[PDB]
Paper text:
[name] glutamate receptors (AMPARs) are ion channel tetramers that mediate the majority of fast excitatory synaptic transmission. They are composed of four subunits (GluA1–GluA4); the [name] subunit dominates AMPAR function throughout the forebrain.
We chose pH 8.0 to ensure strict alkaline conditions for our structural studies and note that the [name]–TARPγ2 kinetics at pH 8.0 matched that at pH 7.4, used in the functional studies above. We repeated these recordings in the presence of the AMPAR auxiliary subunit TARP-γ2 (transmembrane AMPAR regulatory protein γ2). With [name]–TARPγ2, the accelerated desensitization entry and slowing of recovery under acidic conditions closely resembled the TARP-free recordings (~2-fold slowing from 15.6 ± 2.9 ms at pH 7.4 to 28.8 ± 3.6 ms at pH 5.5). Taken together, protonation induces multiple changes throughout the receptor assembly, including rupture of the NTD tier, rearrangements of the LBD pairs and rotational movements of the TARPs, culminating in reduced charge transfer through the receptor channel.
Residue numbers in the entry:
A (entry chain D), C (entry chain B): 508 to 551, 567 to 629, 784 to 825
B (entry chain C), D (entry chain A): 511 to 551, 567 to 631, 784 to 825
E (entry chain F), H (entry chain H): 5 to 42, 55 to 162, 173 to 214
F (entry chain G), G (entry chain E): 3 to 41, 55 to 162, 173 to 214
Write the structure that this text describes.
Amino acid sequence: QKSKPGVFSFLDPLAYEIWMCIVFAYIGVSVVLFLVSRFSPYEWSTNEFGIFNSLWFSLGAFMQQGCDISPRSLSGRIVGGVWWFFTLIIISSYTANLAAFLTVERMTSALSLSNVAGVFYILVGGLGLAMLVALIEFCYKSRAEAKRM
Amino acid sequence: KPGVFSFLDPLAYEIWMCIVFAYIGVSVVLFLVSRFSPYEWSTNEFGIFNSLWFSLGAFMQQGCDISPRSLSGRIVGGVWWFFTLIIISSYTANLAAFLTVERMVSTSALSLSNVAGVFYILVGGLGLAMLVALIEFCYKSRAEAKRM
Amino acid sequence: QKSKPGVFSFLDPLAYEIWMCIVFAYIGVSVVLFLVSRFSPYEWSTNEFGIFNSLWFSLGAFMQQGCDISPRSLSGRIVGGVWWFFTLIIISSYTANLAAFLTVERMTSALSLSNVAGVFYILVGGLGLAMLVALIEFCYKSRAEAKRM
Amino acid sequence: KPGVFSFLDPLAYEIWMCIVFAYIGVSVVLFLVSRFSPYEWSTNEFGIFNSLWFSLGAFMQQGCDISPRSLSGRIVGGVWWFFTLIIISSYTANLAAFLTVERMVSTSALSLSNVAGVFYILVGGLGLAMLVALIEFCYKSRAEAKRM
Amino acid sequence: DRGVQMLLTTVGAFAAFSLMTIAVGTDYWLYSRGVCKTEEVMTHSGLWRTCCLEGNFKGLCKQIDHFPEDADYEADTAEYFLRAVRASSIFPILSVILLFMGGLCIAASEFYKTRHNIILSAGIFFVSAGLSNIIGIIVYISANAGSYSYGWSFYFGALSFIIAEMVGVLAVHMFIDRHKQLRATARA
Amino acid sequence: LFDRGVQMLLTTVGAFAAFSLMTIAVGTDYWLYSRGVCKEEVMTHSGLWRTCCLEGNFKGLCKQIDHFPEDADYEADTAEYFLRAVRASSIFPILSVILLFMGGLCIAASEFYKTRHNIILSAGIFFVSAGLSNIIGIIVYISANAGSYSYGWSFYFGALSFIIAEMVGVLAVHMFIDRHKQLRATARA
Amino acid sequence: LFDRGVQMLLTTVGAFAAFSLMTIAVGTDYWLYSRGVCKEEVMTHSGLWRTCCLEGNFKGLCKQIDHFPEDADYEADTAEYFLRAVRASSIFPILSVILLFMGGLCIAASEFYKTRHNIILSAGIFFVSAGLSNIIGIIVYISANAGSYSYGWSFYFGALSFIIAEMVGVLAVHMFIDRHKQLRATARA
Amino acid sequence: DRGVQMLLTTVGAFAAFSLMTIAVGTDYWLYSRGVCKTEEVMTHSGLWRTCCLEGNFKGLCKQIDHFPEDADYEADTAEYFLRAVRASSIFPILSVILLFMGGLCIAASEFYKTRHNIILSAGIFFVSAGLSNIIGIIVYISANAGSYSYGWSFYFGALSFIIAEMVGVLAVHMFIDRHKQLRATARA
């Protein structure tokens, strides 16, 4: 008999090792892009590829959401290109394996909310975390400002 | 005889409703964490109207003119990007499963009847946009004519 | 028996009526975007949405290739949003139907060059047409300059 | 026992070779139709180095910093976009067909052995970029000493 | 040249109107098999009636029944609404009407040069006519779905939509140019 | 969107309407229209705490919802038990009600000691958090239910309450932005 | 990339190398290593016109390729017949050879009457068109092949010719840009 | 502050080096049922030796044979190369060596303040060590592929990669900070 899908069942198409290596690859690519973009004093910055901006660029590249900035040097562009190829392959693999899962049942109807409830929980948790960080920043600036005056 | 809005079949109606609510909440939280702080006054063009536009573009996975720059705005954007990626991949995979299982049941190409509803929605949106633009033009012209 | 796939067999997943309506919808969306972007003298130009630029924006939106410019008004944004939803649905449907066709045989190996030789032909033809247009532009500018002098 | 580079399975070897050739041809044609005319001298940042970057970004369906503005450059971009869309959709559909057919043959999730090749390619690209950056820094440092 | 733009706009508007009027009235919308007298014989069908082609009853047109009440079945209300929309051909007729109104606006614009809003109205009418043509094509194909080929009457409407969109683009350019010249005069 | 007096009235009426709608949604047994045993199978209308009969032999017989049924519940993992515990308590709808009330009280108290601008901001975060809580509650309710049916007006009463709460949350921050705009504008002079 | 004399020599040697590689590719019967009959199926190396036996009992015996076989060819659509005719004529590889030759002629004639800057632009255009024709020819040949095999060195000789031609074609347009840059520099001063 | 940056860089470099060295030599890489010195019993497997758990032969470790030549099979040379890479553990050991070199460069950078290239070298070494850690993890998992759980030794290397990447970011940030200070002196 078919069991009720888990809350975080949207991560099923890829193995947990793949997700772990995806996180490490993302971190490594962000660090390498930051290093090749800003280490050289002879490039000073002309680009906006700090560590925070490099992490944002890598995250946007993986999620296929474009980028507000683009690498301009040869090394930064090599990093961006290999990351783009990796992202394309991984996203295609995820979509293909999810389709295979939904087509063949092992021991079709519309996807129910229970199949994607975990992504909704993660979304709301991220919204709450961002709200908390913003409130913390505002409170810290409010106390620090009165210290100056 | 596929339904007019049969392109929404791969996802349940509750998923679509919750997608609308999630989009609204993400846009509101974006406007919140972007403009609430007077200490950031702004340096970013993320208002209520622009946050909705950014969220819609992120969900449709289309080119964005701007991106959030603060830590909290970027957290909102990243979690929305993850949600959008998962949802769009789920839609594509479930549609593929539908079509494959229908194919293996004892012409082949998708017909216009399968996607008539999206065409209707597109033309209705174009008409609504024209109507809104005409209303704005009439308001601006009447205001200026009386002013002069 | 399985037939040797046609040269232009990459259009198989969608019906010819769908492709024709896609072209018509693209033209209509481009025209509506241009009109709602530039008709009002009170918006004059704040944006860069000419007819050529509107066509470029719609073409980029359909291929999911980002955009150099983005609509800023409410009406232009409505046009962009409905076009984005249409593009998402259509591309997902194309991918899903192609997967269904490649999975089930009616009366699995790697895709061969015969399956995409068509799209290769349109690519090379487009490159040649672009080269010819650029050469015509250069020839026209060369003759006019001597006419001026 | 999947091969290291088994992620290239959905498309044949000739398809990949022709993809590389078509990318090179599109980049060269874009460079020519962008910079050959002295009458446009320029108004576009489309050199041979930038044309290859635009073509690679378009094939990966990733955000482009610049887009062609002339008619010929836009024709090149449009045909490249159509080619890229068809090729990427074909890859995804053929991979889905492979996995679905393997699933119905008389554990479920993709293992790391199926994408080990793409991981190796990514790490090798990172190393190559680091080497290129170090060589550039050393060459500039040698020039700086010579000038001083 | 503004005169060239005027000539092209009026010529294209008239051409699109004539093509779409021919498409609505003529009968070469679709080639399909079936009996033309209510045997299987190739026939050509339009929006209102279908007639025999290369048959014993050649030339006998028969009205197209858009409500198959033989089995007295209704199914869902969406099918009935689509049947009602297709039977009246409200969207092709609306496209014809909007093209005619755009042509009337273009013709009346020369009488009153001061009022630039007539050109804008013509452009809006042309674009709305194109949208109505798109809706009509979608409805027609959807109704047909629930071997065949399309004739020149159907392709007349397809080319009429393209011309109407192009004329609408030109008309808005005239509205833009007129206001730009008005602003240019004010600065001087 | 314009002025300040009309903005205050609009925000207040929106907050009050959202609070009333969410209170009705929490306290009314019209959430799901599904056939079930409300004592054989019969058409029933359900809510958050009790499922009650409809058009049956004993119409109007209202019975408590079995959230942790006996007779071989078959158990589950920790996640399913946790989800059932949340659904039984309906904390997230209750948390949404509490946050809506706190935001409304902050809005009401904002008129007193108007020099305190952070009260309106506090109401803004309260309303945004109430909307997020409404989202979590709706998702949890639907996931618990799914594990022919139609949703009642109280479920769509709660859906409206979340939607209203976000614009009221939107308006409050606009007021907070304008109040700090006024401080900067007079500071220049 | 730097100076002008070294660029000219590099471009000339690249054009000649590409011309030689394509001339060998179009005239060598080593394009595909596949099982077939060169007169029982045996390992043979094929080309554009003739295929010779390999490690067979009659080695080195070449026969013309049956581009339009008799004995119930079963016919096909007009598109397949057109593709077969294009492959048999090898119109695109031969046109590539011709375009490389005329680009080399334009480059050689560029030294004479150096005031004509459009000759180098013509050479670049011809080289790029030759690369495009090479792409078409390779695609047509592979498609006709798929109507265990491996490709010979001549096929890879043809593959290198396309790369070199576009590389050389890139350099030629750079000269056209630099030559016109010099004209603008001397015109301003 | 530059002093806090140096302290954090040194502490993180030592932490990553120690954690990764512990990971390389320890045996809690993976939990899987298996055999000790030659019944299938739960075992904890490392990188060179597999030891039995709660069995009859509990506490005994057995060396891992990375070349299963019992049937004398080779198949493709890619598998042999991958097995040789896994057997030698070249990439985890290379990561250890690069972390040690980066730490040595950081330590020696305090001796020569003028020579800022040692800080850049340390950052490059840390980044390369993280990349080698990633390659080693990928190779280890792929070799395991050809019920199980991962122990603290494997997760020690995983967290060692994260720290080394964080230390590499700080090392590069220090390099640019010193160069920016030098340029400020030239401006003054």
